[PDB]
Write a protein that binds this ligand. Structure first.
Ligand SMILES: Nc1nc2c(ncn2[C@@H]2O[C@H](COP(=O)(O)OP(=O)(O)OP(=O)(O)O)[C@@H](O)[C@H]2O)c(=O)[nH]1
Ligand SMILES: Nc1nc2c(ncn2[C@@H]2O[C@H](COP(=O)(O)OP(=O)(O)O)[C@@H](O)[C@H]2O)c(=O)[nH]1
Ligand SMILES: Cc1cccc(C(=O)N2CCC(C(N)=O)CC2)c1
Ligand SMILES: Cc1cccc(C(=O)N2CCC(C(N)=O)CC2)c1
Ligand SMILES: [Ca+2]
Ligand SMILES: [Ca+2]
Ligand SMILES: [Ca+2]
Ligand SMILES: [Mg+2]
Ligand SMILES: [Mg+2]
Lengths: 440, 423
């Protein structure tokens, strides 16, 4: 019951999915062949981890996941990698020719040739669920598949599953690791097209993760592997409420109630701590107070923005590991006196807390120290609209000259779709201003 | 044989209800397996009020457990006295209510409600003469609030001349799970105004302050709060569970002078921290019982006036000294009792004390000061509703804004009604 189906779209979605499912297996004690010796109910069960893993009669624990990409080379590494036995072959779907960093090819020219097969595979996963809760969709904003095919898939999932919840983990582009000049175009197009189909979206700014790796982990030139290991820890913190049971556990959906005051205002800001190397963590035990205070350090946010220059509409603290409410309450009291956390006047100001007792885990060969306790803060702040503004400005510079637009028109799109998408973004920026103004 | 049918709905409703049945099962000498092992005939005199007698001298609570998710009732079934409940009396769905009054009242709750009524009807059909019903629930969630008030409405349709009583936990931003609690509580309060005869208002803020300030608990939990609710529920039902006077209707007739003003503030004494073996004198019991700090609605009685007051004293004590102290509290603070209801302060005594105490006192007030509770809720409701904040959770279930505006006016009318009798 309460199953969650994960969908990983494009290179960024697939590679982040690799890191997440490896981490999940380590947290739950699942071996690369899918066996889980601690699971005494063979072939089934209703344990908390069954939200993300189905079971076969042979004792295999199989991720409730589909991997999809329009070219094969990334998913091919999964097919031949360490966890190749984890997935059934039909869960890994590839085409031959990718979207060439063109939303139009991902949503139309190329995506339309594989969308039906993808939906059929998702249906096979749904049929095995006794109480499907919804989907988790991982994808980049900047790639042609991550943008165009994700939006096509989200539209089709609304039709085939109605208002069943769909959450996103969306990779927001940064110049240090970007691969296409037109990524601002693709980002605005998919954000516009997906907006009414997504119930909640966690943006991950690649530049924020890049800075954290360089600053806190002493990684000179972070790679996708470095970035994805950190992203997986944040993803794990957010989904841990769904995969583990506990007296103090609070379900992600209950945080969602507080985080989304209006349908379009559904982009929480995530902050994670502690991010520290083994060399620095040695003999340095980071307390509940220390990791909590770090949550309000802007340098630890998953999206670059200044919450001090906006207003809060919600603040949630998701703890895991050796944490008890007494220490949380004391930590929060301190913060409430040294940081002015300004809420809009129409919203309560109490922090919402959940605790999962299962301690954090790390993948061998990684950069993060193993820690006894960690926290992910999820806040709804008007400041996250800064991320839209930066993207919209790059869009405007190019679109005023119609640079690169012929690539999209040549694949069937119309200039009207660009202005329509950009106007929706302008309205969204204005919405974020409006909700922050005090009531009359 | 004046049977009462007990219903507990949602997470809060089932967790407080489970503790209530643990407390009174102990008082009546009923073990977790339903077998009687007391030593006083007073334990069984009125046992059929809350328990059905099964084969083999087994006593089974006349209780129905309701929820839209399985988690909490799984905990109850595995809890201390979980095995004492009738297995068929567990009625639950899988979807959950998402802290959403509309889901409990109009969609998810609507799909399950008929099966709950089947169990209610079954229990009512085996009653020699049913008094009425008691429901335990919170108002700030979705199942207890939304589906609980749906159940009350359908029970009144099928049993229109039976008394409906609730223990209703009021939300507070100090002890809050979600921000929509004032929405759910405002929607429920109107249902209660229309469809219950008596509602005990239990404010989570008052329960917290008692645990933190008086009981000196550094980190109060929901369990600590429920300990106070269990003790209070046992206190206010003593006169129903032991020889006295008497039944729900007679209580209502002497407590409720106007039909809509049926929301009570309960209180308990002693409330002692761990100096716990000290003997408590009748004056101490009487002074604390009327102290605002001993009350669980988070309303200052000195801000309003008592329409009616009931006080129950438990334990082997001097009934002569009880009257002297009671008559002393009234005749020393008569400015807070309306003078147009003569002799509106009634006192009752019960010989059997609660477990672990030589004597205790329970307080039931129908005070116009309860308007402060409804004012707090109304202000929190409007702060969000002015901006239509979080409404999409409710319109997605088919509700319209007009229903929120009507609930807003209904509760402000209720506040206005209390204010006229306070002057
Ligand atoms: N954090 C992270 N970002 C990635 C990763 N792979 C790609 N990206 C980012 O994703 C954007 C490019 O999109 P991709 O996911 O590679 O493209 P795609 O979805 O495969 O679509 P096409 O190749 O155009 O068909 C750039 O901003 C990259 O920096 C990854 O593994 N981790
Ligand atoms: N006193 C008390 N209040 C509770 C408890 N559990 C939840 N609440 C309160 O009830 C409201 C949440 O409703 P809940 O019963 O959990 O939702 P439901 O399961 O949908 O009915 C909030 O105001 C909580 O503070 C409990 O065990 N004791
Ligand atoms: C479909 C639907 C229905 C109701 C609200 C929205 C919504 O997301 N906003 C953004 C916030 C804005 C405001 N309050 O200033 C109002 C519209 C969308
Ligand atoms: C102060 C108090 C008293 C009694 C119980 C609680 C409690 O366990 N929660 C759950 C978590 C919730 C939150 N804000 O996250 C607050 C209520 C808190
Ligand atoms: Ca199993
Ligand atoms: Ca607007
Ligand atoms: Ca249904
Ligand atoms: Mg690609
Ligand atoms: Mg709850």
């Amino acid at each position: 019951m309460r199953e969650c189906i994960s969908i990983h779209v494009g290179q960024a979605g697939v590679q982040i999915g690799n890191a997440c499912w490896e981490l999940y297996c380590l947290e739950h004690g699942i071996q690369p062949d899918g066996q889980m010796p601690s699971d005494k109910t063979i072939g089934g069960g209703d344990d908390s981890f069954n939200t993300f893993f189905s079971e076969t009669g042979a004792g295999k624990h199989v991720p409730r996941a589909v991997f999809v990409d329009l070219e094969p080379t990334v998913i091919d590494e999964v097919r031949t990698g360490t966890y190749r036995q984890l997935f059934h072959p039909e869960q890994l779907i590839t085409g031959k020719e990718d979207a060439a960093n063109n939303y139009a090819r991902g949503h139309y020219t190329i995506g339309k040739e594989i969308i039906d097969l993808v939906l059929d595979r998702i249906r096979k996963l749904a049929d095995q669920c006794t109480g499907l809760q919804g989907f988790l969709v991982f994808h980049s904003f900047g790639g042609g598949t991550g943008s165009g095919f994700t939006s096509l898939l989200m539209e089709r999932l609304s039709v085939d599953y109605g208002k069943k919840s769909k959450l996103e983990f969306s990779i927001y582009p940064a110049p240090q690791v970007s691969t296409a000049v037109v990524e601002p175009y693709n980002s605005i197009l998919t954000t516009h097209t997906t907006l009414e189909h997504s119930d909640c979206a966690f943006m991950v700014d690649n530049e924020a993760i890049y800075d954290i790796c360089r600053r806190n982990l002493d990684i000179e030139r972070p790679t996708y592997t470095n970035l994805n290991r950190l992203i997986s820890q944040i993803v794990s913190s957010i989904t841990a409420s769904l995969r583990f049971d506990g007296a103090l556990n609070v379900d992600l959906t209950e945080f969602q109630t507080n985080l989304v005051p209006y349908p379009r205002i559904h982009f929480p800001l995530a902050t994670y701590a502690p991010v520290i190397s083994a060399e620095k963590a040695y003999h340095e035990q980071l307390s509940v107070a220390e990791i909590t205070n770090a949550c309000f350090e802007p340098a630890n946010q998953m999206v670059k923005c200044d919450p001090r220059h906006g207003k809060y509409m919600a603040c949630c603290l998701l703890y895991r590991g050796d944490v008890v409410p007494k220490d949380v309450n004391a930590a929060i009291a301190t913060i409430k006196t040294k940081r002015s956390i300004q809420f809009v006047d129409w919203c309560p100001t109490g922090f919402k807390v959940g605790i999962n007792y299962q301690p954090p885990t790390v993948v061998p060969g990684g950069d993060l120290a193993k820690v006894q306790r960690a926290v992910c803060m999820l806040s709804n702040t008007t400041a996250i609209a800064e991320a839209w503004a930066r993207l919209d400005h790059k869009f405007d510079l190019m679109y005023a000259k119609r640079a690169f637009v012929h690539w999209y028109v040549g694949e069937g799109m119309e200039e009207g779709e660009f202005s329509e998408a950009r106007e929706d973004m302008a309205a969204l920026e204005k919405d974020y201003e409006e909700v922050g103004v005090d009531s009359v | 044989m004046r049977e009462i049918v007990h219903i507990q709905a949602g997470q809060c409703g089932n967790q407080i209800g489970a503790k209530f049945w643990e407390v009174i099962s102990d008082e009546h000498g009923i073990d977790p397996t339903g077998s009687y092992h007391g030593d006083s005939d007073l334990q069984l005199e009125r046992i059929n009020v809350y328990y059905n007698e099964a084969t083999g001298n087994k006593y089974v609570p006349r209780a129905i457990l309701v929820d839209l998710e399985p988690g909490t009732m799984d905990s109850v079934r595995s809890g201390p006295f979980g095995q004492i409940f009738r297995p068929d009396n567990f009625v639950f769905g899988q979807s959950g209510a998402g802290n959403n009054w509309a889901k409990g009242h109009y969609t998810e709750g609507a799909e399950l409600v008929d099966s709950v009524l089947d169990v209610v009807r079954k229990e009512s059909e085996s009653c020699d003469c049913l008094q009425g019903f008691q429901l335990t629930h919170s108002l700030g969630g979705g199942t207890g609030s939304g589906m609980g008030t749906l159940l009350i409405s359908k029970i009144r349709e099928e049993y229109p001349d039976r008394i409906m009583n609730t223990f209703s936990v009021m939300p507070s931003p100090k002890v809050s799970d979600t921000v929509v609690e004032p929405y759910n509580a405002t929607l429920s309060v109107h249902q209660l105004v229309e469809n219950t005869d008596e509602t005990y208002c239990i404010d989570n803020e008052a329960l917290y302050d008692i645990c933190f300030r008086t009981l000196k608990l550094t980190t109060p939990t929901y369990g600590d709060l429920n300990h106070l609710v269990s003790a209070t529920m046992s206190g206010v039902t003593t006169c129903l569970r032991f020889p006295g006077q008497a039944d729900l209707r007679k209580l209502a007739v002497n407590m409720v002078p106007f039909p809509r003003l049926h929301f009570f503030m309960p209180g308990f004494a002693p409330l002692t921290s761990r100096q716990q073996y000290r003997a408590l004198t009748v004056p101490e019991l009487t002074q604390q019982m009327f102290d605002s700090k001993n009350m669980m609605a988070a309303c200052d009685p000195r801000h309003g006036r008592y329409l009616t007051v009931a006080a129950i004293f438990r334990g082997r004590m001097s009934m002569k000294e009880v009257d002297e102290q009671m008559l002393n509290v009234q005749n020393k603070n008569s400015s807070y009792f309306v003078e147009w209801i003569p002799n509106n302060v009634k006192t009752a005594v019960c010989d059997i004390p609660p477990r672990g105490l030589k004597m205790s006192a329970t307080f039931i007030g129908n005070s116009t000061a309860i308007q402060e509770l409804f004012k707090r809720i109304s202000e929190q409701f409007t702060a969000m509703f002015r901006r239509k904040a979080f409404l999409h959770w409710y319109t997605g279930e088919g509700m319209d804004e007009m229903e929120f505006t009507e609930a807003e006016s209904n509760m402000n009318d209720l506040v206005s009604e209390y204010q006229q009798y306070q002057d």
